[PDB]
Amino acid sequence: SELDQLRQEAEQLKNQIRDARKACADATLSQITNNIDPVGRIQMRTRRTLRGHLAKIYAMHWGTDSRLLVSASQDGKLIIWDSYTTNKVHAIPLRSSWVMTCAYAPSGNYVACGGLDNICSIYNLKTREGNVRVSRELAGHTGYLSCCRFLDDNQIVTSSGDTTCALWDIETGQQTTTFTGHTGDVMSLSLAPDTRLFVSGACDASAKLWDVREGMCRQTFTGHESDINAICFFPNGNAFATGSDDATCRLFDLRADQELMTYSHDNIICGITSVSFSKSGRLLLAGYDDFNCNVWDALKADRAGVLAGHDNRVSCLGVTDDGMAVATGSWDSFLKIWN
Amino acid sequence: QVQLQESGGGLVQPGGSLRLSCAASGFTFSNYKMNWVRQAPGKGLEWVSDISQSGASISYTGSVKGRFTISRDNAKNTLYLQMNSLKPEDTAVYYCARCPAPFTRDCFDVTSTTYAYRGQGTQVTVSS
Amino acid sequence: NTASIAQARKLVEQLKMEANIDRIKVSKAAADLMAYCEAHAKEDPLLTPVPASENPFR
Amino acid sequence: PSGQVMDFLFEKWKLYGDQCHHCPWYLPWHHKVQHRFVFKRCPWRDASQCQMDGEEIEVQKEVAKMYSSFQVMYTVGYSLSLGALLLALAILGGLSKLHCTRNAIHANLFASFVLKASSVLVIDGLLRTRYSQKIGDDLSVSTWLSDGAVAGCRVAAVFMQYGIVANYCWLLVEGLYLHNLLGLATLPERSFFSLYLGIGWGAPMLFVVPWAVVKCLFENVQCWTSNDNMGFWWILRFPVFLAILINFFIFVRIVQLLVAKLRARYKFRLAKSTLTLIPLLGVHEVVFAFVTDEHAQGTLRSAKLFFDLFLSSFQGLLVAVLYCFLNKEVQSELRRRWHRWRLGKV
Amino acid sequence: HSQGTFTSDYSKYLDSRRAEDFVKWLEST
Amino acid sequence: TEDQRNEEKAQREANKKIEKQLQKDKQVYRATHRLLLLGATSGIFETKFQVDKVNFHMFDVGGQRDERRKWIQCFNDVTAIIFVVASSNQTNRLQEALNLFKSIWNNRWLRTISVILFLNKQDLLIEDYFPEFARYTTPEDATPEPGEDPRVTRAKYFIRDEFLRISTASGDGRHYCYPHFTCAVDTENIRRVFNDCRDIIQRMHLRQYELL
């Protein structure tokens, strides 16, 4: 059949790509950094505790002033907190109970949320009246919304469970570019500092690099076993990290197009829900299903600290822009701030 | 990358015996549970059988109960299916698939072709 | 039919597009991360604990 | 002898010296020894004709051993329960996860048990000291029958009477809270914790204050620990009987519900469930409730004071063991702390 | 309750003991 | 200066107002029963009804895909799951339904939820697919419909026990299964749902007090 020859040509191309990557592999990251010394001992304690929500919590996001943050819960509420003084500011009731993601605008004038209704809703905070009401609704996805990240006040990028990603125009309300490369559901995404490229992880155990302007995939990163749950991007601009259900984190390099590190331990069996980096890119923090977080070391791959003290599953994780605080959420209704 | 490749499909008259196998790579074989899946012509996907991580637990679909058997080799990362006393009803395309999560007793893999962790299959036909 | 053959033909095109990419050596692309970390190692308030005087989360 | 037989004896002797020159009659057992008199020697001095009956002394000698044994028994009983209750209160407060309304009623009941156990020991301790001092000089007892000496005992008496009544109310609150849960189908919206707290703590307060006022005006007998008028002693028992009478019907209903849940789907679980339920509702009290104080003279009064004083002393230990130290949710949460503190050292 | 009646009986027993001890002291001295 | 105290007072007043609103929201939220409806806005559906002044709120998932291993974890804190089965060439849908039931029963995050089962189209109603419909006998305690068809009754009580085997093979102690045959048509299903919900709630409290 004509399908067989095309398949064998694809296999030959895959073999050529694998050989090209194998040729460039001169040394490992461990050997180069074997000379440096360990970070030491890192211990953190809970400085603040927030007790507003009723049901479990799925998402949170930090503000660019590193003082306000929004959180989403499955009872149908959005709450904006003040991190310095534990008092709330806004409480926003949602039309649909199951919200699965939330984002905070860089300017501080908008927030977003989405869930099983397949719709993304934009909320206006600063208004003449003084209340909060929906501005726009973005329909068109054929699957539940799972992540959204503001690019500016007029643009946003979303991922859903119909194996596609889209770029929206808020005032127009119509899709502009669609990225159809994945096979399974898309779980998370992360934007670059210059907001020119971004990466996503799906349930096909693969990650991709997208071009916002052109609109087609440039690189595909493989080598993983199971579904990818979280993804974060490195401060420099040439690396990113992933987390998944096989209890393993990995480090990838855009300019080298290869995997560089693996963060796994023998007694760790549960999955990974969220990952994040530190300000200098030296500490890699992650959340697990065993109710506590871990602090890794990106250059040497050894465990330095542990963030315990949660009564249920940890779902979200975040680090401030100035890097002076860390906030975590969990399936119990409490938020903790660590420093 | 996860990859599966089946082999051993061939035409056979009623009463014959066939042997099927698919070899896995790119993941730890001992940590996952395997299945067998068929697709009859003009009909949807149908689950056939499954085997536990250590091979202790075996299940069958009832239509083929008492005629088929399943075994796995952890050392060589290979799955086997033994077929005896075939009838013209058995003609279909056979797939071998695994469920996505390790250390789990529940699997969701009898879905459409969209399932990523599946092979390509070999044609098996019975006629005269 | 046509959709299947188009989908199959798209895969090889994407594969050749990914193959036609310039790469570098791992050694050059690995020292950059540690150089960056050493350069910005004095501005990390979590790697090196700050005194409680400037800490606003006491 | 209705109390204050020492008061009458001292007053009559003073009246004897009051007359001066214008057996002795002021003797308590004079009525049965009127005929005999004292020898003309010139009982005051050198007189052995009139004394108590040796059989009376022999009888009085045997009744002290029973009191001593009973005192030792309940003194040993209260201490272990008190220690267990303190240990259980510490654990429930030290684990942030075990914060619920149920645990709130449990802790409030533990506090009442602790208060009662502490009050009984304190009132017992400072009462054997009063009767353990030598009479000595005649002018040394004038300050022993005064209000100043017994100032610190009548406060302890009130504090001991309040603790006993405030413990029978939380037993009723426990039954009322559990009976309400199974009656209605959904969750009971908000909890009436304020109403339950008021019933538990402030309802005793309106039964003992009326008692103390009557005790101070009409029955100001020494040390305020002897009951002479049954009518005034009926004030503190009506709320006691009411609680157990209410709690019996709740116990019966819960057992019927348990039987229904097992029939519509054995005997070992149906026997294990009631045995642990009895200490939380107090059915051992209604077992002997109808044998009242007045109609009890012989061994029927001594067995009733043994059964109830043996089962009441260990009821504080039993509830703590059954509900705190044996709970699955407590044993699964205590081991997590051990692992967290262990792995933090490696 | 049993505690109150037991305490009452114990106090009444102690009171007579004290009275008889006073009588014994009076007759002895 | 004095403006700081004014800002703090305003912030505390706003906090007090929103806490006052959340108190009423909490009172309303926890007196409602949430049900999930399975089978065999466009994304999600809603439905409200009341029986004996009790609030129910059912959810139908008809806008999603057929890969439900990810969005099914959002329903781990519901009261019960309703599972509709068509008891009636076919493609052996009974085995697919049984496998889905087994997966739901054995899932980690749904390993404590009860299931209410509804067999439908009894009027329309085994020997080729299941080779055990020949050494089976009708259970002693049965209430056959006035139809009195021996084969139909045998099929009904062979299908019910097939589902009961999965439920009784594991998950012993903290969840159960309530099978119903949909002989009643018009409005007798909601009363049954009410009864099972009441039973589940009572058993939950009894388990919490460790009397069962």
Side-chain angles (χ1 to χ4, degrees), chain A residues 1-40 42-128 130-339, chain B residues 1-112 114-128, chain C, chain D residues 1-40 42-133 135-344 346, chain E residues 1-23 25-29, chain F residues 1-15 17-76 78-186 188-212:
Chain A
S1 189
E2 277 292 350
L3 194 148
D4 311 327
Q5 61 91 31
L6 191 60
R7 182 177 177 179
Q8 76 184 358
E9 288 291 328
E11 183 69 28
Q12 294 298 109
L13 286 174
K14 188 180 289 184
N15 272 270
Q16 181 178 0
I17 291 171
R18 186 177 65 221
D19 281 14
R21 293 180 181 177
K22 174 64 175 64
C24 306
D26 290 335
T28 77
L29 189 152
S30 295
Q31 273 150 21
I32 297 169
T33 76
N34 219 347
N35 293 319
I36 75 170
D37 44 36
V39 291
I42 288 159
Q43 293 179 356
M44 293 180 183
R45 68 184 299 278
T46 317
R47 298 289 154 111
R48 302 289 195 267
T49 289
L50 314 175
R51 300 171 199 263
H53 289 292
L54 308 172
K56 60 187 181 290
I57 297 165
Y58 270 58
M60 61 79 71
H61 203 207
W62 273 100
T64 61
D65 63 354
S66 69
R67 189 173 174 177
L68 305 161
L69 73 164
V70 70
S71 71
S73 179
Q74 283 213 340
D75 48 317
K77 288 289 182 182
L78 286 188
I79 292 179
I80 294 164
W81 313 79
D82 192 306
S83 66
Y84 284 12
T85 72
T86 61
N87 51 36
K88 298 177 286 292
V89 175
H90 278 113
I92 311 189
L94 312 170
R95 185 179 67 189
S96 163
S97 296
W98 295 269
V99 57
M100 293 177 71
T101 183
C102 77
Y104 182 76
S107 50
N109 308 328
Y110 300 94
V111 290
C113 66
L116 287 170
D117 53 355
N118 309 339
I119 304 189
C120 185
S121 294
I122 312 303
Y123 285 95
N124 191 357
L125 286 186
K126 311 300 200 195
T127 194
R128 156 186 38 214
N131 54 4
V132 176
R133 59 171 58 89
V134 192
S135 291
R136 298 294 296 163
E137 307 191 335
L138 314 168
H141 270 288
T142 301
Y144 62 92
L145 190 67
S146 71
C147 197
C148 47
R149 275 298 169 273
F150 264 99
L151 188 153
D152 71 271
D153 291 331
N154 206 60
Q155 289 179 354
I156 202 180
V157 65
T158 78
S159 60
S160 77
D162 63 346
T163 69
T164 62
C165 291
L167 188 86
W168 302 80
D169 189 334
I170 287 168
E171 65 183 1
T172 300
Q174 297 295 110
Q175 288 185 356
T176 299
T177 317
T178 305
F179 312 96
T180 63
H182 278 291
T183 300
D185 300 357
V186 191
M187 288 292 108
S188 63
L189 57 88
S190 196
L191 290 160
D194 54 344
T195 55
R196 298 292 183 184
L197 305 171
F198 69 99
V199 290
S200 47
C203 289
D204 48 359
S206 68
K208 293 180 186 279
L209 180 67
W210 302 101
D211 200 316
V212 174
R213 292 180 180 177
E214 283 209 359
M216 65 182 179
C217 173
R218 319 209 101 180
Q219 301 191 38
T220 314
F221 302 83
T222 59
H224 193 270
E225 288 178 26
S226 193
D227 311 315
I228 289 172
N229 277 327
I231 198 172
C232 185
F233 183 76
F234 187 87
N236 189 359
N238 301 330
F240 63 93
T242 62
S244 60
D245 281 356
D246 55 8
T248 290
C249 289
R250 287 178 156 87
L251 186 70
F252 289 97
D253 208 285
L254 267 59
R255 185 174 65 189
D257 212 3
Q258 293 179 357
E259 174 204 329
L260 300 186
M261 270 270 166
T262 304
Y263 313 93
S264 69
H265 193 26
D266 290 331
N267 72 68
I268 286 172
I269 301 299
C270 60
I272 302 162
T273 68
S274 62
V275 300
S276 190
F277 270 101
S278 161
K279 169 157 189 102
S280 166
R282 183 66 186 270
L283 305 171
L284 178 48
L285 296 91
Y288 296 84
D289 291 23
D290 60 17
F291 304 170
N292 56 19
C293 301
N294 276 14
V295 175
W296 290 91
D297 180 10
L299 298 187
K300 295 177 75 70
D302 61 287
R303 190 172 70 182
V306 164
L307 290 185
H310 263 294
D311 294 332
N312 211 328
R313 189 200 193 155
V314 170
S315 61
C316 48
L317 203 74
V319 182
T320 60
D321 296 71
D322 53 14
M324 293 177 71
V326 177
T328 79
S330 179
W331 270 13
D332 60 340
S333 66
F334 316 116
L335 286 89
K336 312 279 201 51
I337 292 173
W338 306 83
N339 187 16
Chain B
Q1 188 192 5
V2 176
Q3 184 178 2
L4 295 157
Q5 180 75 264
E6 304 95 347
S7 305
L11 189 146
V12 68
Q13 309 155 352
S17 307
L18 278 187
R19 186 70 177 272
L20 294 174
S21 62
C22 64
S25 82
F27 57 89
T28 77
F29 202 77
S30 179
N31 277 313
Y32 295 95
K33 154 176 166 188
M34 314 291 324
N35 306 76
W36 274 102
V37 169
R38 77 159 89 191
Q39 169 158 350
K43 289 191 285 185
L45 280 299
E46 183 178 1
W47 158 87
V48 170
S49 66
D50 63 358
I51 187 167
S52 179
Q53 294 179 356
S54 47
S57 314
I58 305 193
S59 283
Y60 299 95
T61 186
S63 177
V64 303
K65 163 72 163 305
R67 293 194 309 120
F68 287 176
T69 187
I70 185 171
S71 62
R72 64 181 293 165
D73 200 335
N74 286 318
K76 292 189 299 185
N77 307 356
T78 300
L79 211 71
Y80 305 108
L81 187 64
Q82 181 89 48
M83 294 177 71
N84 288 324
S85 67
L86 282 72
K87 61 183 71 174
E89 184 179 2
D90 273 30
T91 179
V93 180
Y94 284 74
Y95 297 150
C96 71
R98 75 151 172 98
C99 47
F103 320 116
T104 63
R105 279 200 55 248
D106 48 293
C107 308
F108 297 85
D109 55 17
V110 185
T111 181
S112 188
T114 311
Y115 195 58
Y117 316 126
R118 204 193 281 155
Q120 282 290 33
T122 187
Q123 168 83 53
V124 160
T125 180
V126 176
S127 279
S128 178
Chain C
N1 292 318
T2 301
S4 179
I5 65 169
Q7 197 269 357
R9 186 183 295 274
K10 188 182 289 184
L11 185 62
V12 296
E13 173 73 21
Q14 168 76 26
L15 272 188
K16 83 178 295 190
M17 185 195 159
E18 291 183 355
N20 290 348
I21 295 178
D22 266 320
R23 295 166 180 93
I24 69 173
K25 293 182 183 293
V26 173
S27 69
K28 181 69 176 177
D32 286 355
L33 292 199
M34 65 166 303
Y36 179 96
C37 283
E38 272 149 26
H40 296 63
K42 194 65 178 67
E43 296 176 354
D44 207 338
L46 293 177
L47 185 83
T48 64
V50 296
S53 179
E54 293 83 3
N55 196 1
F57 273 108
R58 66 180 68 87
Chain D
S2 87
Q4 71 186 353
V5 73
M6 179 45 150
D7 272 4
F8 276 49
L9 192 153
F10 181 80
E11 182 65 26
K12 298 293 183 182
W13 178 75
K14 186 179 290 294
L15 195 80
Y16 205 106
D18 191 350
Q19 160 216 54
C20 168
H21 186 73
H22 306 62
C23 304
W25 50 271
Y26 64 85
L27 265 59
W29 49 86
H30 164 104
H31 181 74
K32 72 196 303 300
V33 73
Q34 303 163 299
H35 316 315
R36 277 83 63 85
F37 195 63
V38 60
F39 273 32
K40 299 296 185 290
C42 184
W44 256 107
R45 279 89 59 87
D46 318 299
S48 289
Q49 179 66 42
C50 55
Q51 324 273 324
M52 320 192 66
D53 308 284
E55 59 90 17
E56 292 293 328
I57 295 90
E58 290 295 328
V59 172
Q60 295 298 109
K61 185 183 287 185
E62 294 293 328
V63 294
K65 271 171 196 323
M66 182 179 72
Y67 288 136
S68 312
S69 52
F70 278 40
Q71 211 156 6
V72 160
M73 176 183 81
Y74 73 80
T75 292
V76 159
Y78 286 164
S79 306
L80 278 73
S81 67
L82 184 63
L85 289 163
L86 295 156
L87 183 63
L89 280 164
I91 290 174
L92 290 179
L95 277 296
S96 79
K97 181 173 198 180
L98 303 174
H99 286 183
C100 301
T101 315
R102 177 156 68 66
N103 276 327
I105 295 90
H106 290 352
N108 268 277
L109 178 88
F110 296 167
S112 76
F113 269 115
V114 161
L115 185 64
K116 172 192 212 167
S118 167
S119 70
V120 163
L121 291 161
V122 172
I123 191 167
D124 192 3
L126 59 85
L127 166 65
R128 72 165 67 94
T129 306
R130 191 171 163 59
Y131 288 103
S132 297
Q133 310 197 345
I135 297 168
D137 186 74
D138 171 87
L139 273 298
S140 179
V141 298
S142 296
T143 187
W144 188 90
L145 279 70
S146 66
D147 291 331
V150 298
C153 303
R154 319 201 187 182
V155 165
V158 167
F159 174 58
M160 183 278 288
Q161 302 277 5
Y162 179 78
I164 290 179
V165 185
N167 177 53
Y168 275 105
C169 279
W170 277 101
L171 272 297
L172 170 64
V173 163
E174 274 271 29
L176 280 185
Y177 175 77
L178 183 60
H179 177 84
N180 184 56
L181 281 185
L182 317 161
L184 59 85
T186 54
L187 289 202
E189 316 206 350
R190 65 181 294 276
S191 67
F192 294 98
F193 198 47
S194 296
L195 183 63
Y196 289 135
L197 191 66
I199 289 181
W201 284 120
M205 200 96 78
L206 61 83
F207 284 103
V208 66
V209 176
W211 174 78
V213 166
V214 177
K215 194 79 185 149
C216 168
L217 272 71
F218 308 129
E219 184 178 1
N220 193 343
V221 175
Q222 183 176 181
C223 191
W224 291 4
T225 61
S226 297
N227 319 303
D228 176 29
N229 189 359
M230 295 296 172
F232 297 164
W233 175 223
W234 263 113
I235 285 181
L236 293 174
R237 300 206 306 275
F238 185 78
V240 162
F241 285 166
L242 184 63
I244 62 170
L245 283 193
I246 291 181
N247 261 351
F248 196 70
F249 293 99
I250 295 170
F251 175 79
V252 173
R253 291 273 146 201
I254 289 164
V255 183
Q256 291 179 359
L257 183 64
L258 276 185
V259 174
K261 295 292 182 184
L262 297 149
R263 183 177 292 171
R265 178 71 274 172
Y266 176 76
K267 181 67 174 66
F268 182 76
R269 185 67 178 172
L270 186 59
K272 182 179 182 292
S273 290
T274 67
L275 272 168
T276 187
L277 204 54
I278 291 171
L280 196 75
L281 298 178
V283 180
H284 68 86
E285 190 71 26
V286 60
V287 161
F288 272 104
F290 286 66
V291 180
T292 189
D293 191 350
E294 293 83 3
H295 307 295
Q297 267 78 27
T299 185
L300 175 67
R301 179 202 188 89
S302 312
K304 191 255 286 181
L305 290 173
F306 178 82
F307 192 77
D308 280 312
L309 289 180
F310 177 76
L311 285 175
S312 294
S313 301
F314 295 92
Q315 196 181 4
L317 172 63
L318 290 178
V319 293
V321 170
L322 286 174
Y323 286 90
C324 186
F325 295 164
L326 183 63
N327 201 22
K328 288 310 201 200
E329 203 167 31
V330 179
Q331 285 183 327
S332 66
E333 182 65 26
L334 268 181
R335 300 295 182 185
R336 283 186 43 204
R337 284 305 177 109
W338 185 258
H339 296 51
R340 176 185 317 185
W341 187 68
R342 186 185 65 151
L343 190 147
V346 178
Chain E
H1 45 83
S2 288
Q3 200 64 57
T5 175
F6 178 76
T7 299
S8 173
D9 286 4
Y10 180 64
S11 287
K12 298 178 167 170
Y13 158 75
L14 274 181
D15 179 53
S16 295
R17 296 294 86 193
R18 178 96 176 168
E20 281 153 18
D21 291 331
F22 191 64
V23 166
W25 170 88
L26 205 52
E27 63 177 49
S28 297
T29 302
Chain F
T1 60
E2 189 67 27
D3 52 356
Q4 187 268 333
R5 274 87 73 187
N6 294 320
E7 298 294 328
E8 201 70 358
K9 181 161 258 194
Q11 199 168 185
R12 302 160 65 260
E13 193 274 332
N15 189 7
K17 184 177 179 181
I18 55 185
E19 290 185 26
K20 182 62 65 68
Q21 181 62 255
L22 298 171
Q23 183 66 41
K24 291 174 71 176
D25 276 352
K26 184 177 180 180
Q27 293 179 356
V28 161
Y29 171 85
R30 64 193 299 271
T32 305
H33 280 314
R34 275 157 304 267
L35 312 165
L36 171 65
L37 180 70
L38 264 171
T41 72
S42 178
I44 200 74
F45 294 82
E46 307 294 24
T47 294
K48 299 293 271 203
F49 54 101
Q50 270 201 12
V51 169
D52 281 28
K53 275 219 268 188
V54 175
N55 293 328
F56 290 101
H57 186 31
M58 192 157 67
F59 306 102
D60 186 74
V61 291
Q64 302 290 343
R65 283 207 312 164
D66 63 358
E67 308 213 58
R68 64 179 64 88
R69 69 167 171 279
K70 288 293 182 182
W71 60 257
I72 207 163
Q73 312 167 354
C74 298
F75 304 92
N76 64 7
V78 292
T79 297
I81 290 181
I82 298 170
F83 195 87
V84 183
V85 187
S87 52
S88 49
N89 297 115
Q90 59 188 357
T91 310
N92 202 350
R93 296 178 180 89
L94 270 299
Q95 191 79 57
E96 180 178 0
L98 283 159
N99 288 132
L100 178 59
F101 186 97
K102 185 183 287 185
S103 287
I104 288 181
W105 197 259
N106 275 263
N107 185 16
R108 186 189 167 183
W109 310 105
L110 314 170
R111 185 177 292 171
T112 53
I113 311 298
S114 309
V115 185
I116 294 162
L117 193 81
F118 270 105
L119 282 73
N120 277 323
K121 62 179 73 175
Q122 300 301 327
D123 290 328
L124 271 297
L125 181 62
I126 55 172
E127 290 180 352
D128 186 74
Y129 288 154
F130 297 158
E132 69 275 16
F133 189 47
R135 306 165 289 287
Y136 184 64
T137 184
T138 316
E140 301 294 328
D141 53 354
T143 60
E145 199 176 1
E148 305 289 330
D149 292 331
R151 171 188 56 91
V152 175
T153 302
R154 197 179 179 183
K156 268 164 72 173
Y157 285 91
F158 173 63
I159 301 299
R160 188 195 68 154
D161 286 84
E162 182 65 26
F163 278 102
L164 286 176
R165 288 172 186 170
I166 291 159
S167 66
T168 58
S170 65
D172 47 352
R174 74 281 191 190
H175 48 97
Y176 292 106
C177 180
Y178 307 83
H180 298 276
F181 305 114
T182 311
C183 301
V185 178
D186 53 357
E188 276 286 349
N189 287 346
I190 297 169
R191 201 68 214 181
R192 299 157 170 189
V193 171
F194 186 91
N195 298 342
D196 307 283
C197 282
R198 192 204 263 271
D199 187 7
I200 290 178
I201 294 278
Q202 295 194 272
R203 294 208 178 230
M204 183 278 288
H205 289 311
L206 284 170
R207 256 200 317 271
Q208 282 185 355
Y209 266 83
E210 290 183 353
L211 305 167
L212 283 179

